[PDB]
Amino acid sequence: KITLTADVMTYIHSMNSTILEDWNFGLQPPPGGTLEDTYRFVTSQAIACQKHTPPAPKEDPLKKYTFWEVNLKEKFSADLDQFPLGRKFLLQLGL
Amino acid sequence: KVVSTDEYVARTNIYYHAGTSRLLAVGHPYFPIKKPNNNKILVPKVSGLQYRVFRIHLPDPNKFGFPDTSFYNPDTQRLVWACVGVEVGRGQPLGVGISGHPLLNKLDDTENASAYAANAGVDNRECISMDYKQTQLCLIGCKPPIGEHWGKGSPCTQVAVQPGDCPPLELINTVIQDGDMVDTGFGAMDFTTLQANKSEVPLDICTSICKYPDYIKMVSEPYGDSLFFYLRREQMFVRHLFNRAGTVGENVPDDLYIKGSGSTANLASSNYFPTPSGSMVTSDAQIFNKPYWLQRAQGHNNGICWGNQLFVTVVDTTRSTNMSLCAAISTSETTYKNTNFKEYLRHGEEYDLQFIFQLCKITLTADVMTYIHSMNSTILEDWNFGLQPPPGGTLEDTYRFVTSQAIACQKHTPPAPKEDPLKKYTFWEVNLKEKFSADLDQFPLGRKFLLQLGL
Numbered sequence A: 001k002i003t004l005t006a007d008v009m010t011y012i013h014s015m016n017s018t019i020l021e022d023w024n025f026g027l028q029p030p031p032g033g034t035l036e037d038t039y040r041f042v043t044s045q046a047i048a049c050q051k052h053t054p055p056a057p058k059e060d061p062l063k064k065y066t067f068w069e070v071n072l073k074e075k076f077s078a079d080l081d082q083f084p085l086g087r088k089f090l091l092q093l094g095l
Numbered sequence B: 001k002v003v004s005t006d007e008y009v010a011r012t013n014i015y016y017h018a019g020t021s022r023l024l025a026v027g028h029p030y031f032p033i034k035k036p037n038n039n040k041i042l043v044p045k046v047s048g049l050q051y052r053v054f055r056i057h058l059p060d061p062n063k064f065g066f067p068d069t070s071f072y073n074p075d076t077q078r079l080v081w082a083c084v085g086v087e088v089g090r091g092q093p094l095g096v097g098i099s100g101h102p103l104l105n106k107l108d109d110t111e112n113a114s115a116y117a118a119n120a121g122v123d124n125r126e127c128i129s130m131d132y133k134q135t136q137l138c139l140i141g142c143k144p145p146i147g148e149h150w151g152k153g154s155p156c157t158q159v160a161v162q163p164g165d166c167p168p169l170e171l172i173n174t175v176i177q178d179g180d181m182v183d184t185g186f187g188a189m190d191f192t193t194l195q196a197n198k199s200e201v202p203l204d205i206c207t208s209i210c211k212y213p214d215y216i217k218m219v220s221e222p223y224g225d226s227l228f229f230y231l232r233r234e235q236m237f238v239r240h241l242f243n244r245a246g247t248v249g250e251n252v253p254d255d256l257y258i259k260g261s262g263s264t265a266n267l268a269s270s271n272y273f274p275t276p277s278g279s280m281v282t283s284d285a286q287i288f289n290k291p292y293w294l295q296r297a298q299g300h301n302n303g304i305c306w307g308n309q310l311f312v313t314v315v316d317t318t319r320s321t322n323m324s325l326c327a328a329i330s331t332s333e334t335t336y337k338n339t340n341f342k343e344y345l346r347h348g349e350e351y352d353l354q355f356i357f358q359l360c361k362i363t364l365t366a367d368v369m370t371y372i373h374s375m376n377s378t379i380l381e382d383w384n385f386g387l388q389p390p391p392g393g394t395l396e397d398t399y400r401f402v403t404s405q406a407i408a409c410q411k412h413t414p415p416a417p418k419e420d421p422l423k424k425y426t427f428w429e430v431n432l433k434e435k436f437s438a439d440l441d442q443f444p445l446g447r448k449f450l451l452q453l454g455l
Helices: A006-015 A018-022 A035-046 A084-093 B215-220 B366-375 B378-382 B395-406 B444-453
Strands: B010-019 B023-027 B041-043 B052-057 B077-090 B099-104 B106-109 B126-130 B134-141 B146-152 B169-175 B210-213 B229-235 B237-244 B272-277 B291-293 B311-316 B323-328 B341-363 B428-431
Touching: A006 A018, A035 B366, B010 B077, B010 B444, B052 B341, B077 B134, B077 B311, B077 B444, B126 B272, B146 B215, B291 B444, B341 B444, B366 B378
Parallel strands: B052 B428
Antiparallel strands: B010 B341, B023 B341, B052 B311, B077 B291, B077 B341, B099 B126, B106 B237, B134 B229, B134 B311, B146 B169, B146 B210, B237 B272, B323 B341
């Protein structure tokens, strides 16, 4: 996890914009903010669940190049015990 | 998930009284009197069977100018009006009306016959009258009442109905508007559309629609804004029994009798119908001129007159007596000349309302707001949140705020007044903006209520 404060953010951005851009910060309720604000927030926030799903997928910034693609999105697991590496690693570190 | 207003609504120790001076309405008991050629109603229809609906307007609490304003913080909440006490004033002396129709589709007394009925010629209708079902009722809410009734429901694309063919039915909900008709003892339906006959019921209702409070639905309401308080009192019985003249729509299955013979040979109409009769009225029966304390309500909304609005809906036959007034054409002839006198019919209604309201504040936080909005946008929209100084905000912000805020007092007063979202409908308007008071001691209800609660 990464607590995102100003400096933090900045540093990251400066380091590599994308990182943040890629992420998404769902609008949140402004602390102690003027009712007006809060209100508006609600509204906007409310009209944010219109089920409209038009999220234009970004483009591979390296489409140019080509290499062996390896999708893992559906291969993550917790009980490493069920895996060699897991076992090894696990035991290795111990805890 | 919904919740009782008590959750988000804060109750103050402030109470106010308000009530109409004395409402009065007079007109024709059966129909309006308008110019034959024209349409402008010289005289309006006025009967004890008209649904009395009141759009009670209240002054904006937040906009109201109070003595002390400490009790709450305008930077965190808004004020709302909450009714807690109401009394309905009925001024006319107890009495009964009576309606009918010169050519009601009456056939013959089915109650008891010596010998079989005659034969159906044409235009056998007659002039009759009656005393509809006795009904007392009233209800209140921040939203208007919704009636149910019967009507010609749209059909299916099949046998293109053969003229005369029986129409299909459909229960219909509708906003009970002021003046509408209450069940008379004939049910709730669009007599107009359902009875082409135009002589099945007394005139006063002939061309109209009898409505009934769709209590059920009203309560089923989650927020339950429709109505939070009410009480009904109806009763009636069979005065007479009659046969409906006309032609058989659906025939009697022979497997339910033995063929006639001679006079009997031919079947008489089986389509009977009764004469409603609201029995005698009594004082002890009375339901108005009594105070109602809306302390608790089984509904989620607890008398939160949102938008500073209100809906008192009443119905009372108990004082229906209409007076037959007659004027002569010539102060001469010492002999009664039927043609020397013009007969008229008039009915009047005396009303007067009064209530007690508790002031209420509502801390507006996110969830809060949301809930409200979700519940009913308007509420907030209607309110106004003057820009405020952002806490600890960047000087830049604060600054800008100032500017904007500053340029907000340019004396420019172009506030386009909103539009009645129910302009469509129409009912008895009741402005109270200038009738609120604190020293309830100066008022009956006040006294009563006051003492009643004690503190």
